[PDB]
Amino acid sequence: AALNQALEMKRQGKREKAQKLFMHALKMDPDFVDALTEFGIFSEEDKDIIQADYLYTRALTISPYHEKALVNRDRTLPLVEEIDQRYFSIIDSKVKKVMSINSALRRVMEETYYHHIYHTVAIEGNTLTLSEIRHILETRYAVPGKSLEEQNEVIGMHAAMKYINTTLVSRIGSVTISDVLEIHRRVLGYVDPVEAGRFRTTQVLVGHHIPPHPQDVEKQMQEFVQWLNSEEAMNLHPVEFAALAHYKLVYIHPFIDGNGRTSRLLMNLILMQAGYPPITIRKEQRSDYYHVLEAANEGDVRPFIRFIAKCTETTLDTLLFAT
Amino acid sequence: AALNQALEMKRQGKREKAQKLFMHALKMDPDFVDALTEFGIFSEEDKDIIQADYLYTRALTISPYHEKALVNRDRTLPLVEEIDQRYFSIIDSKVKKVMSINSALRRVMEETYYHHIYHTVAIEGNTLTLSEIRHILETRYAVPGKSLEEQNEVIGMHAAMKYINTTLVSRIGSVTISDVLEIHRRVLGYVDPVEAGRFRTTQVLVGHHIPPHPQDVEKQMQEFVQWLNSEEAMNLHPVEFAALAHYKLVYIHPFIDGNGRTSRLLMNLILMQAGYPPITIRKEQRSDYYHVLEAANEGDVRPFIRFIAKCTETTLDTLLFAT
Ligand SMILES: Nc1ncnc2c1ncn2[C@@H]1O[C@H](COP(=O)(O)OP(=O)(O)OP(=O)(O)O)[C@@H](O)[C@H]1O
Ligand SMILES: Nc1ncnc2c1ncn2[C@@H]1O[C@H](COP(=O)(O)OP(=O)(O)OP(=O)(O)O)[C@@H](O)[C@H]1O
Ligand SMILES: [Mg+2]
Numbered sequence: 001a002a003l004n005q006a007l008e009m010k011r012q013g014k015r016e017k018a019q020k021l022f023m024h025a026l027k028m029d030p031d032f033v034d035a036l037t038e039f040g041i042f043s044e045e046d047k048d049i050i051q052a053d054y055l056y057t058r059a060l061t062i063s064p065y066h067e068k069a070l071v072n073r074d075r076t077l078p079l080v081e082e083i084d085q086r087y088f089s090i091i092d093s094k095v096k097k098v099m100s101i102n103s104a105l106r107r108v109m110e111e112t113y114y115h116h117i118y119h120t121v122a123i124e125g126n127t128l129t130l131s132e133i134r135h136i137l138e139t140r141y142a143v144p145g146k147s148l149e150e151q152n153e154v155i156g157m158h159a160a161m162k163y164i165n166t167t168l169v170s171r172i173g174s175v176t177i178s179d180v181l182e183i184h185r186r187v188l189g190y191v192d193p194v195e196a197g198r199f200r201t202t203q204v205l206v207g208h209h210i211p212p213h214p215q216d217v218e219k220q221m222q223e224f225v226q227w228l229n230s231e232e233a234m235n236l237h238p239v240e241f242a243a244l245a246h247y248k249l250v251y252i253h254p255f256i257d258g259n260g261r262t263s264r265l266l267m268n269l270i271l272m273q274a275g276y277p278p279i280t281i282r283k284e285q286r287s288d289y290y291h292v293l294e295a296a297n298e299g300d301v302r303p304f305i306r307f308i309a310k311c312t313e314t315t316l317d318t319l320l321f322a323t
Numbered sequence: 324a325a326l327n328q329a330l331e332m333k334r335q336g337k338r339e340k341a342q343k344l345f346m347h348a349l350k351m352d353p354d355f356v357d358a359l360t361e362f363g364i365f366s367e368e369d370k371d372i373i374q375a376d377y378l379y380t381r382a383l384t385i386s387p388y389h390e391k392a393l394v395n396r397d398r399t400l401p402l403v404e405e406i407d408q409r410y411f412s413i414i415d416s417k418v419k420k421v422m423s424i425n426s427a428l429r430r431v432m433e434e435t436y437y438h439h440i441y442h443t444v445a446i447e448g449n450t451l452t453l454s455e456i457r458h459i460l461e462t463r464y465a466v467p468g469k470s471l472e473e474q475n476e477v478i479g480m481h482a483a484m485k486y487i488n489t490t491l492v493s494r495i496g497s498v499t500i501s502d503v504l505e506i507h508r509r510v511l512g513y514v515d516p517v518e519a520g521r522f523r524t525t526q527v528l529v530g531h532h533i534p535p536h537p538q539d540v541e542k543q544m545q546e547f548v549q550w551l552n553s554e555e556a557m558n559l560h561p562v563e564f565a566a567l568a569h570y571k572l573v574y575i576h577p578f579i580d581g582n583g584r585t586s587r588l589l590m591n592l593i594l595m596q597a598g599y600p601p602i603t604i605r606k607e608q609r610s611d612y613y614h615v616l617e618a619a620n621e622g623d624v625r626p627f628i629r630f631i632a633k634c635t636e637t638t639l640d641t642l643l644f645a646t
C-alpha cells in the first residue's frame with residue numbers, strides 16, 4: 001500500500017515525510033503486518049526501541065510466524081524488559097529520597113489533595129475548578145452556576161479517600177469485594193445513592209470494549225480480589241501491581257458509573273500500602289490514558305504500566321523539587 | 324398547692340388569671356391528679372370537652388380509682404368518641420367533593436408538590452425557600468450561599484416521593500420492610516449515603532424519648548409491618564391509620580436521621596392508597612406536632628390523631644377553593 005512510498009521516502013532523506021506515510025497505512029489497516037514491522041525498524045532508527053518492540057509484538061499477534069517480525073522481536077524482547085526494570089529502579093530511588101524527610105513536605109501533601117480531586121473528576125468532564133473545589137470542601141456551600149451533580153462528585157471523592165486513609169491503608173489483611181463496594185458507595189453515593197456500592201444490572205460499552213455481562217460480574221470480581229491477595233501479585237513491582245489492579249477493574253467495569261474513579265483510588269491504595277505516595281493522572285492525559293487502556297485490550301498491557309510509571313515519577317519529582 | 328389559689332381565683336371572676344394559675348401546678352407537678360381533674364372541669368366551662376377528657380384520662384393513668392376523675396370521664400368518654408367520629412365524617416364528605424372534579428385542580432396539585440417539599444424539609448430547619456427549591460428541582464443547578472446538605476435534602480425528598488408514586492401507590496400487595504428502606508435510601512442518600520436505607524447501629528435520644536435499642540429495631544420493625552398489613556389496621560379510618568403508622572415508625576426511630584421525613588411520606592402512602600390527597604404538616608406547626616407526639620409517648624395518641632385530621636382538613640379546604 002502507501003508503505004511502499006513510506007520506504008521510498010525513507011530511502012535517502014524524508015524522515016518527517018515518511019513518518020506520515022507509515023501512520024496512513026496504519027490508519028487504513030491497523031493489522032497490516034508488513035507496515036508494523038517496517039514501522040518498527042523505522043522507529044528504532046530514532047532510538048525508540050520501546051515503540052519498535054510494541055510494533056513487532058503487535059505484528060506477531062496477527063501473524064505469529066512472520067520471519068522479519070520474529071528476528072527483530074527476539075532481539076528486543078529482553079532488551080525492553082531490561083529498559084523497563086531500569087525505570088522501576090529509578091522510581092525506587094526517588095521513593096527512597098522522598099521517604100527520607102517534616103513541615104516543607106506537609107505544604108505539598110495538602111496542595112496535592114485538592115489537585116488530586118480536581119484531576120480525578122475533570123478527567124471525566126467535570127467543569128469545576130480547583131478554587132471551586134476548595135470552596136465546596138472547605139466551606140460546604142454550593143458554587144453558583146455549576147450543577148449539583150458536579151459538586152456532589154467532589155463531596156464523594158473526598159468522602160471516599162477519607163474512608164481509605166481512615167479504614168484501609170493502615171489495615172492488616174486481605175482486600176475484600178466489600179472494600180471495593182464501600183469505596184464506590186462514597187465515590188458515587190451523593191450523586192446516585194441507588195446504584196452506589198452496587199454492581200451493574202445491565203450490559204454497557206466503554207469506548208470499543210464490551211465488559212463482562214452483569215450475570216458474570218460477581219464471578220469476575222471474586223477472581224479479581226483473589227488476584228489482589230495472590231502471592232504472584234505480592235511479588236510484582238508495586239507500580240506494576242497498581243497499574244494491573246486498575247486495568248483489571250476498569251476491564252471488569254462492575255459499576256454503571258465511577259469505575260475509573262474507583263480504579264484510580266484502588267490503584268493508590270496499592271501504592272500507599274507499598275510506601276509509594278498517591279499518584280494523580282492529570283486531566284490533560286485523558287487522550288493518552290484512554291489510548292493505553294485500549295492498547296491493553298488489544299493485547300499489550302505494557303504501555304499502560306509505563307503510563308502509570310511516568311505518572312508516579314512526575315508525582316515523586318513534585319515532592320522532591322519542593323524539598 | 325397553687326391549685327387551691329386556682330380554684331379561689333375561679334370562684335367569682337378571674338378566668339384568664341386562674342388559667343395561668345392552673346398551668347403553674349401542672350408545671351410544678353404534671354402528675355398532680357387533683358390538679359388535672361380540677362383543670363378538666365375548668366376547661367369544660369370554656370366548652371373544651373376534648374381537653375377536659377385528656378385531663379381526666381391523664382389523671383386516671385396516675386390514680387385509676389380517683390372518684391372525681393372517674394365520674395367525669397365515664398361521661399366524656401363516649402361524648403369525645405362521638406365528637407371525633409363527626410370530624411372524620413366531615414373529612415370524608417370533603418374527600419367526596421374533592422374526588423368529584425380537570426384543569427383548575429391541576430394548578431393546585433403542581434403547587435402543592437414544591438409546597439410539601441418546602442415544609443417537610445423546612446420543618447427540620449432547612450433554610451431554603453420555595454423559589455430556591457423550584458430552581459434546584461427544575462434546573463438541577465445549585466443555589467448560591469446555601470449549604471450543599473440543605474440542597475441534597477431537597478433532591479432526596481423529590482427522589483423519594485417520585486419512587487413512591489412510581490413504584491408503591493398503585494401497587495397491589497403488602498408493605499414490606501424493604502419498601503421503608505427504599506424510601507429512606509432516597510430521602511437520605513444524597514446527604515448520607517453510608518447510613519441511607521440502613522438501620523441505627525447506636526442508641527439515641529429524641530427530645531425526652533429513648534427509642535428501642537439497635538438490637539431490637541429489626542424485631543420492632545417486623546412487628547410494625549405486620550400491623551400495616553393487619554386486618555385491624557385495614558378497618559381503621561384512613562386518617563387514624565395514617566397517624567398511627569407515622570407515630571409507630573417515629574417511636575421505633577429505626578434510622579439515625581430522616582425518620583420524620585420517612586414517616587410523613589409513609590403517612591401519605593397510606594392516605595393516597597385510601598383515596599385521600601397527600602397532606603402536609605407546615606413548618607409553623609413544629610411546636611404543636613412535637614407536643615402531640617410527646618403526649619402520645621405519655622399515654623394518649625388521640626391528640627396526634629386529631630392533629631393529623633386537622634392537617635388533612637386544611638389540605639382538603641385548599642383543594643376545595645376550586646368549587
Ligand atoms: N477501552 C477501555 N477499556 C477499559 N476501560 C476503559 C477503556 N477506555 C477507558 N476506560 C476506563 O473507563 C473509565 C470510565 O468509566 P466510568 O464512567 O464508569 O467512571 P469515571 O469515574 O467517571 O471515569 P472518568 O472520570 O475517567 O470518565 C475511564 O476513566 C478509563 O479508566
Ligand atoms: N418526643 C418525640 N417522641 C417521638 N418522636 C418524636 C418526638 N419528637 C419528635 N419526634 C419525631 O422525630 C422526628 C425527628 O427525627 P429525625 O431527625 O430522624 O427526622 P427528620 O427527617 O430530620 O425530621 P424533622 O424534619 O422534623 O427534623 C420528628 O419529625 C418527629 O416526627
Ligand atoms: Mg462518568
Ligand SMILES: [Mg+2]
Nearest residue numbers: 447579580581
Ligand atoms: Mg434530623
